[PDB]
A paper describes a structure:
The mature alphavirus virion is approximately 70 nanometers in diameter and has T = 4 icosahedral symmetry. The LBD is comprised of eight cysteine-rich complement-type repeats, also known as LA domains (LA1 to LA8), which contribute to binding with SFV.
To elucidate the precise mechanism of SFV-VLDLR recognition, the single LA repeats (LA2-Fc, LA3-Fc, or LA5-Fc) in complex with the native SFV virion and SFV virion alone were firstly reconstructed by cryo-EM. It is worth noting that LA5 was also observed to bind to E1-DIII at the 5’ and 2’ symmetry axis regions in the structure of LA5-SFV. However, in the twofold symmetry axis region, LA5 only binds to 2/3 of the E1-DIIIs. In the case of LA5, residues E197, D213, D215, D217, H196, P207, and W210, which correspond to the residues at the binding interface of LA3, sustain interactions with E1’s K347, K345, N325, E292, D327, and G326. However, the sites in LA5 that correspond to LA3’s Q126 and R114 are occupied by S204 and G194, whose side chains are too short to form hydrogen bonds with K347 and E292 of E1, resulting in a weaker binding affinity compared to LA3. Similar to the results with LA3, single mutations (E197A, P207A, W210A, D213A, D215A, and D217A) in LA5 led to a complete loss of SFV binding capacity, while S204A, as an exception, had no impact on the binding of LA5 to SFV due to its inability to form a salt bridge with E1’s K347. LA5 can also independently bind to site-1 to -3 and site-1’ to -3’, but when LA5 binds to site-2 (or 2’), it creates steric hindrance with the LA5 binding at site-1 (or 1’) and site-3 (or 3’). Therefore, in the presence of an excess of LA5, LA5 tends to bind at site-1 (or 1’) and site-3 (or 3’) to avoid steric clashes and maximize occupancy at available binding sites.
Numbering used by the authors:
A (entry chain H), B (entry chain A): 1 to 438
C (entry chain B): 319 to 422
The structure:
Amino acid sequence: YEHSTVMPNVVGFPYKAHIERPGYSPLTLQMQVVETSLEPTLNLEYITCEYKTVVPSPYVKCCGASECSTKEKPDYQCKVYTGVYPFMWGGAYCFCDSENTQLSEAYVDRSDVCRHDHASAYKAHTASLKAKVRVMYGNVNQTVDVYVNGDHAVTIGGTQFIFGPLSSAWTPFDNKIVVYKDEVFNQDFPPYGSGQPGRFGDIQSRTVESNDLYANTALKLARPSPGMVHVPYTQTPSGFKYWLKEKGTALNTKAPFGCQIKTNPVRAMNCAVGNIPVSMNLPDSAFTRIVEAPTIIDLTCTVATCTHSSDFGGVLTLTYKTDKNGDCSVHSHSNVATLQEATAKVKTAGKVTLHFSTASASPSFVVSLCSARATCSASCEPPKDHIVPYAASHSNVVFPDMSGTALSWVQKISGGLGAFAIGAILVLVVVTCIGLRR
Amino acid sequence: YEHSTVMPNVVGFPYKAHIERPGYSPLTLQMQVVETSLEPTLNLEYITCEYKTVVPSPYVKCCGASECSTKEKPDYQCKVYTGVYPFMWGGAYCFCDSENTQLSEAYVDRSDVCRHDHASAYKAHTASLKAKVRVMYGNVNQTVDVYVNGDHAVTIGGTQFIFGPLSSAWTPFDNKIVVYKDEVFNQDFPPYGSGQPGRFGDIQSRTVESNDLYANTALKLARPSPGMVHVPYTQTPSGFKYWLKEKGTALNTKAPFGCQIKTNPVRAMNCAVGNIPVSMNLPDSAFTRIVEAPTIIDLTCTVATCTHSSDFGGVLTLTYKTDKNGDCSVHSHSNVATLQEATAKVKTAGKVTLHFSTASASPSFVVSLCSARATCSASCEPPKDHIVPYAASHSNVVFPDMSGTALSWVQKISGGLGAFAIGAILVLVVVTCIGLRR
Amino acid sequence: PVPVDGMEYHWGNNDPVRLWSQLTTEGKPHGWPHQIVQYYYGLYPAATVSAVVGMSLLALISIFASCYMLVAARSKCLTPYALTPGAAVPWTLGILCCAPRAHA
Ligand SMILES: *[C@@H]1O[C@H](CO)[C@@H](O[C@@H]2O[C@H](CO)[C@@H](O[C@@H]3O[C@H](CO)[C@@H](O)[C@H](O)[C@@H]3O)[C@H](O)[C@H]2NC(C)=O)[C@H](O)[C@H]1NC(C)=O
Ligand SMILES: *[C@@H]1O[C@H](CO)[C@@H](O[C@@H]2O[C@H](CO)[C@@H](O[C@@H]3O[C@H](CO)[C@@H](O)[C@H](O)[C@@H]3O)[C@H](O)[C@H]2NC(C)=O)[C@H](O)[C@H]1NC(C)=O
Ligand SMILES: *[C@@H]1O[C@H](CO)[C@@H](O[C@@H]2O[C@H](CO)[C@@H](O[C@@H]3O[C@H](CO)[C@@H](O)[C@H](O)[C@@H]3O)[C@H](O)[C@H]2NC(C)=O)[C@H](O)[C@H]1NC(C)=O
Ligand SMILES: *[C@@H]1O[C@H](CO)[C@@H](O[C@@H]2O[C@H](CO)[C@@H](O[C@@H]3O[C@H](CO)[C@@H](O)[C@H](O)[C@@H]3O)[C@H](O)[C@H]2NC(C)=O)[C@H](O)[C@H]1NC(C)=O
């Protein structure tokens, strides 16, 4: 028996579905979203880590000269100085007074610990959803892991469930993403090969294991002091440490809809938005023949107390007359009130009680017990507590019933005004007809 | 000196760009697309391969009875039969004449060679383009590899190049893809957990090494024939073997724009569509001072022969007067004609020759040698060879010049008719003025 | 078929071979007007006919409008002489031909 329904994507909300086969007694399902997960698709751009400056020992050529030689090294800088007269601890070598030469050399290379502390640069697109739904009905109670897209069917006790695609296509990750340890940032990083010194991406590598490297830190050499051997240099500090201190904010403490951002892999969990359609296919053994189920007649609904709070703050009672005792499946056909239980045990005493939660001052909903039916209405008082630590258990609908007190007052006033207008219209029509007949 | 241009995405096309700095002699670059690669992003769905039926030996429990036991095996089937009287080569055992039972067992399992011969089901979206471009200017050769998107800068001899995103967003891959060895099929495969026997995907596995398996091949047992021990069964043939014989066509022999599909990784190569914007940044060392370049005056252009063929079927002659001999940059400012050379040897003799290819009956364009300008017009006859094995070297522009023979005839007839109409208007106006002045 | 775009074929185990068409025809350009039409009908034989028909129709419309305007101008100029018992002014008769050749 094929069926379809739409259920909200709110964690912990006890959704109940009603199935009414013409030949069998009605059945009530309970589906609950225990946990979700939003998986984006990532493309690695490059890897940035702190650099380390390699400076070899100078080569002081006594009584001669040397020539610079170009090399293929990241940010290689080499210069040659003349007229140097170095010293050492025991004396001064390079006997030649002024015909000496020093060759200075320096370049940049990736640090030793880059494979432990590095920040990635990704591009994120086409998020994919994943869920974990608990399904219970009759004597069946299981939890399954389902991809939320209409191409994965899971079997629970002989029943086939297909969870349709999410209603909306909203994702919290921008087109560009920077990931560091367990934090995600919505940042726009410089393109590869065009990084600027002193900021994020001063040195870039295509992958942590990649051999090539692009470095730009404006490493510049200076002439050594007289009578010294030290190879002076100046360099703009690493951009990674500037970024590590001035990254600013995050996505863990900034994501909308109250969903946590986690890493390895990058995902956003328990993030309430949209609706998840559900398609079903039930066997004929789940239902019960209507001859076996009890027959319920003369159903009347009365409400004891009502209070539109977050928890189940309503007490509701049914009176009936039955021939045999058994089990029915209760359900509310309007989302103004949400029942707590999906099965009430019917006895010949003819009195059962139910709990419900509502969020409107005066609700009106129709409830069914087995095949019976009845209309419920009540007056509810506000709650006193200002703040509670649990989520709302109702559908959050506020507009009251047309038979409520406020709308009854409005109806009476409008009826009086309409009667006055009708009387005036009738008087005018009679007068003008009399005038026309003359 | 920043510059920008757009180049066709046609492999082998000799694109030439002209840079006109106002303090230096003009420069001409050559860019050629050697190889491209359209790379889609893939998500694995499931893996299908030929199945194998495992049928254990029967357990003939006799002078007693046996009960079937359920197991968690893919497509498991078990039954117990009563009244068997088996026979063997030496005789018949199980003394009890009719009080014997046989237990049959069978199930499905993944084949032995599934990890060398299997078909993959993918989801493809958001293709990424990659290219390899050859650039030459002055004396600098070299080819580079570039990601075709606005976030990769490559330096070639001191010049920074950024290749912008493709103009079009067309991909030959549909949403769903089935990959087999080196063939790609645009196919709509059934969802996981809902495979039908006898067709593609009768058995599915989430990954080649995954333990889980969903098999639906309608395995059914039958009662053994009297006096034998054989465990009969029937089963729908494998769906993978069927798919191998009637998959139909492919994408290698079906893709548009004449681009070959390859596998591992899935990509589409040399696939001509759209335009590639180019952003450039050149240093001052590439240009030449205007004082060093020779001065060219009195530039005239003449055409010897012209045949609008695919190859360079045009000969052009330039006459000039110079003071010294050197090198100029030769360029054509209209796409109706494409020159073969980008630089020419200028001499005091005053005659140079060039080669161009056109696709219009009467081309007209302006050609510059260093800083001089000249206008060329030609009459071209159609070629005689019907079919050639090489691509066209022109821009495929057919509309002739306004000074062409056909347009000249149109101009003459239109002018005659306009003169007649103007005379009509003048006569009518004269008559009307005479009538009004009366 | 081998259009101007080109095509390839794959025969046996050999590598695919590509062939491209070329702009060839049977007309003669740079000649009489009745030969340029043939040359541009060999190429694109669906727009040349439409362009020729459009140009001819426009020329016919223009020439008909001009001839009608001359006729209307002559009729407007000559009709005052018909409302009086006057002459024809043979100076105007020579330039403007009218229905009365010599009789009034
Ligand atoms: C021992 O000490 C003596 C000090 O005189 C060293 O003699 C020096 O040898 C170098 C060898 O290159 C000479 O340099 C050359 O000088 C000429 C002329 O100035 C120049 O054209 C060359 O390009 C090169 O620079 C240097 O002039 C010379 N000193 C003098 C002549 O006063 C000697 O080399 C030392 N022995 C060693 C280091 O084994
Ligand atoms: C349907 O099956 C699920 C399990 O598949 C049942 O979940 C059960 O939920 C209750 C309360 O939510 C769990 O009891 C809790 O145990 C912890 C243990 O530390 C205790 O601290 C709590 O105070 C509470 O008593 C119970 O463990 C859990 N069953 C499991 C995990 O197997 C669910 O109750 C079933 N449906 C019905 C209607 O019973
Ligand atoms: C050696 O051969 C004799 C042949 O008589 C086997 O005796 C058979 O034993 C089985 C096992 O108990 C008997 O089956 C029983 O049948 C009764 C109904 O008569 C039923 O109520 C029991 O639940 C059980 O199924 C069988 O009747 C009996 N044969 C005869 C003729 O009575 C004996 O088991 C063999 N020895 C061994 C070690 O197998
Ligand atoms: C920039 O470098 C490329 C690659 O080195 C140069 O292209 C190469 O040009 C030479 C001729 O100058 C080609 O050699 C000849 O190729 C023909 C092809 O049929 C062959 O039959 C001859 O025996 C001879 O080997 C060479 O093949 C060609 N390379 C490629 C990959 O096509 C290019 O000329 C250089 N740029 C400039 C401005 O020279």
